[PDB]
C-alpha cells in the first residue's frame, strides 16, 4: 500500500515529512494507519513530545500545534491535519497552518492538508475547509487538500500519492 508510494523517494538524501495539527485532529491515528514502522515517542525538550516513524530514508515526524526550527532543514513535505467536524477550532487551525507556512526554512516544502473525520455526519466538506483555511490565497506553494477518514484509512492513499509524486518530481 503506502510503502510503494514512498519508495519513489529512494534517491533523496535523508528527509523529513512533518505532520502537524491541533490536538485531536487525528495525527497519531494516521501515523498508525500508514503501517510503515513503529511509532516512537521522544521528548527532546521538556514538555515537547514528538512521535516519529522511520521508513527507509524518510522520517515522519509528528507533533501537536496550538525550537521546532532544527527539524525544518530537511523537511520536504508538510502535512496539516484538521478535524473537519470541529467548527469551533478551525480558526485556530488556520492560524497554526499559516504560522508554519511563515517559516523561511519551510519555503520549498510541499503542503498536503488532510480534512479528516469526513465520516462524521456534520463534518465540513473539503471545499468549506479550503475556504476556511485560506488555501485559495496561497500563490507560490504547491498544496493539495484531501478528505479523509483516518480510522478507516479512506483518502490517505490518494493524498499521499499526490504528496510523494510532488516531492519525487523535484
Ligand atoms: N470519527 C472519526 N474519528 C477519528 C478520525 N481520525 C481520528 N479519530 C479519532 O479522534 C481522536 C483523536 O485521534 P488522535 O490520532 O489521537 O489525534 P491527535 O491528537 O491529532 O494525535 C481519537 O478518538 C480517534 O479515534 C476520523 O477520521 N473519524
Ligand atoms: Mg497524537
Swiss-Prot record:
InterPro entries, sorted: Arf1-5-like (IPR045872), P-loop_NTPase (IPR027417), Small_GTP-bd (IPR005225), Small_GTPase_ARF (IPR024156), Small_GTPase_ARF/SAR (IPR006689)
Keywords: Auxin signaling pathway, Endosome, ER-Golgi transport, Golgi apparatus, GTP-binding, Hydrolase, Lipoprotein, Myristate, Nucleotide-binding, Protein transport, Transport
Subcellular location: Golgi apparatus; Endosome; Golgi apparatus, trans-Golgi network; Early endosome
Annotated phenotype, changing residue 28 to N: Constitutively inactive form (GDP-locked form); loss of intracellular protein trafficking
Recorded family membership: Belongs to the small GTPase superfamily. Arf family.
Organism domain of life: Eukaryota
E.C. designation(s): 3.6.5.2
GO cellular component: cytosol; early endosome; Golgi apparatus; trans-Golgi network
A GO MF term: mRNA binding
Cytoplasm found in the keyword field: no
UniProt KW Plastid keyword: no
Record comment: activity regulation: Activated by AGD7 and AGD10.
Residues binding GTP, per UniProt: 21-28, 64-66, 116-119
Biological process terms in GO annotation: auxin-activated signaling pathway; protein transport; regulation of auxin metabolic process; response to brefeldin A; vesicle-mediated transport to the plasma membrane
Enzyme class: hydrolase
Protein name per its UniProtKB record: ADP-ribosylation factor 1
Catalytic reactions of this protein: GTP + H2O = GDP + phosphate + H(+)
Subunit relationships: Interacts with AGD7 and GDAP1. GDP-locked form interacts with cytosolic tail of p24 proteins. Interacts with AGD5 at trans-Golgi network. Interacts with A.tumefaciens AK6b.
Function of the protein: GTP-binding protein involved in protein trafficking; required for the sequence-specific vacuolar sorting route to the lytic vacuole, for the ER-to-Golgi transport and for the Golgi-derived transport to the plasma membrane. Involved in the recruitment of COPI and GDAP1 to membranes. Required for recycling of PIN auxin transporters (e.g. PIN1 and PIN2) in a fungal toxin brefeldin A (BFA)-dependent manner. Involved in various auxin-dependent developmental processes.
